[PDB]
Design a protein around this nucleic acid. Structure first.
Lengths: 32, 65, 115, 155
RNA sequence: GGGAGACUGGAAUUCCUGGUGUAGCGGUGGAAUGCGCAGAUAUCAGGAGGAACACCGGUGGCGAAGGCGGGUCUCUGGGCAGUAACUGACGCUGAGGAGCGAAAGCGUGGGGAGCGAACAGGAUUAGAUACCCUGGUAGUCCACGCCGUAAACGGUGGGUACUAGGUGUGGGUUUCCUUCCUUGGGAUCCGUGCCGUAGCUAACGCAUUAAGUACCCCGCCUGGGGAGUACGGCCGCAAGGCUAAAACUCAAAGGAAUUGACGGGGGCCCGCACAAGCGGCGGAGCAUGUGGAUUAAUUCGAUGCAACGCGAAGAACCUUAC
């Protein structure tokens, strides 16, 4: 295939994981 | 290409005690010679390598002089 | 002291060359280094520096009264042959040359490769 | 000279002596483009040698150049930005060429303030072996023999 | 070298103790942090400890995959061939389910040589939270449990039958020459590579180890983003994993191959390109052109090679445009 597709997917996943890390304590507070 | 001297009828058995037959197959540094050089089959080459390692572990051949 | 027959150790790496003359029992009687002869930095990795270091160490060994020397060499050579010839040209007689380089049997971990 | 060696130039036979060494020397000492003056300079030097040694010029110049003819040379070969000095033997032609070039080039340094006696004196000194050309020859052989180690490139 | 347990061998790195020994060692494109002169590096002798197993060793073997090689012993799983005595269709697939599952990560207790996220300096640089250098904690290791993901790839689910061949290689049975050894030749079963027809494909390519010709069963797909995200639920100590949308937005996103162009990608061949030699420039003075500052302008163009004794082959007025 072409690596542009994997590149788009990796960037989206990277941004989501960064967001998850940024809001860990808040999410634990709300979910509990 | 040569032949496996052990696949012949008169091929002697491989023993880890037999220093001369094992030393036939070790180089001047003590390392074991490759299968292409010696010309023996896979099975007998494995037997030779294991016998040489056994002899090394009991101080009959040097650990790579 | 009077030792008429000693041994020579040449360590030749990619950054320096060290020459040591020892007794047959290993006691060091003279040594010279590639940076001991006025070379600093990368300049001390060249064959010329190895030649000068070998000459200097051979001189120092000669004032202690050594005639014949055996050679054990070690490391990734850049100034091996140069050091051998410099030892020969200083009046010492090179008896035997043997390469003793430590070669592991796959233990320990090499440092990560450069890029 | 990239494809192959150019054909060698012919040498015109010397009319007065019959050997081309003298005409080679006068061609080399020639400068500014004048054959007559250089010819007279070399001939004056040769005749001073005649009157000072009492022997035949051809043979004395022959063994003088033979005694100052180099045998080996040192050549540079560069790898990785660092140079190496390799010894290569020399064909006799370039050996004589270099010897005569040394003679002519250094014949402008004798302090007797005239070129013709300069040539006569240096020719006689090289005939006696005390000339500076002998010194350069010995230096070249010292360089060749001392650095005989670095020749594994085989050139 | 399929798996589990126990014991055990040598090389090498580091550290410690002790001789000799002196001023350096280390590192790099070059260095500098750094280690030494309070005795480093180097060279010998003794000792401690941990991890990985040179040579054999490769597109070679084994395993359902993940994966598996120092030696020995004990326990143990699968495959192949020959005979065909035995049971007599007992077979195939398999929604959900269960088990196994690299590395990183988590819990408890050990261990810790080397390597090395994070973290410190040094260097480069306009800046370098990097590449390079010197140190260095978690981890890598062991025991018992968690998580359940990878470009977990042949980007190719499993079972079965048929469709030209040539040539390497691993394991096993047999016939004819038999020198009776040798890949002696043939026949046949099971794996593993290369090349090649017919056939198939958009093309690349596959091609008896099919992506050909056919039958059975399962999983999955329906334009690109939003998004493998939110909401709800299940699992986990945690990290997170699994199931899985909608609003809105675009008129395309893609696959293979062709021709140019480009590369801080290669290989050959040329040129005073290098080498070989001669004579110079760079040092002195003078003559022009130019960059720089001035006043009234110091007229304008020309700017690496490919601008600079060039436009301008002739500035007291004219030429001159100041």
């Amino acid at each position: 295939g072409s690596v542009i597709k994997k590149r788009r997917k990796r960037m989206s996943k990277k941004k989501h994981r960064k967001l998850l890390r940024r809001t860990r304590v808040q999410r634990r507070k709300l979910g509990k | 290409t040569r032949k496996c001297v052990f696949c012949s009828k008169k091929g002697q058995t491989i023993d880890y005690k037999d220093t001369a037959l094992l030393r036939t197959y070790i180089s001047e540094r003590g390392k074991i010679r490759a299968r292409r050089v010696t010309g023996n089959c896979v099975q007998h080459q494995r037997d030779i390598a294991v016998a040489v390692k056994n002899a090394r572990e009991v101080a009959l051949l040097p650990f790579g002089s | 002291k009077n030792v008429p027959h000693g041994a020579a150790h040449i360590k030749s790496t990619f950054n320096n060359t060290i020459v040591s003359i020892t007794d047959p029992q290993g006691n060091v009687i003279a040594w010279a280094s590639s940076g001991h002869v006025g070379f600093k930095g990368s300049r001390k990795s060249t064959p010329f520096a190895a030649q000068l270091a070998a000459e200097n160490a051979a001189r120092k060994a000669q004032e202690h009264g050594v005639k014949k020397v055996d050679v054990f060499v070690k490391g990734p050579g850049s100034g091996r042959e140069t050091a051998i010839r410099s030892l020969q040209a200083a009046g010492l007689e090179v008896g035997t040359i043997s390469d003793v380089t430590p070669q592991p049997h796959n233990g320990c971990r090499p440092p990560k490769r450069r890029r | 000279p990239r494809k192959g060696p150019a054909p060698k130039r012919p040498l015109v036979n010397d009319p007065v002596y019959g050997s081309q060494l003298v005409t080679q020397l006068v061609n080399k000492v020639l400068l500014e483009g004048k054959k007559s003056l250089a010819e007279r300079i070399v001939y004056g030097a040769l005749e001073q040698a005649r009157e000072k040694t009492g022997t035949d010029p051809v043979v004395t110049l022959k063994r003088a150049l033979d005694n100052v003819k180099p045998a080996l040379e040192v050549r540079s070969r560069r790898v990785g930005g660092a140079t190496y000095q390799v010894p290569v033997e020399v064909r006799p032609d370039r050996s004589t060429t270099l010897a005569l070039r040394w003679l002519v080039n250094f014949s402008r340094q004798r302090r007797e303030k005239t070129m013709v006696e300069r040539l006569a004196n240096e020719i006689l000194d090289a005939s006696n072996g005390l000339g500076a050309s002998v010194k350069r020859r010995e230096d070249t052989h010292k360089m060749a023999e001392a650095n005989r180690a670095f020749a594994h490139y085989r050139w």
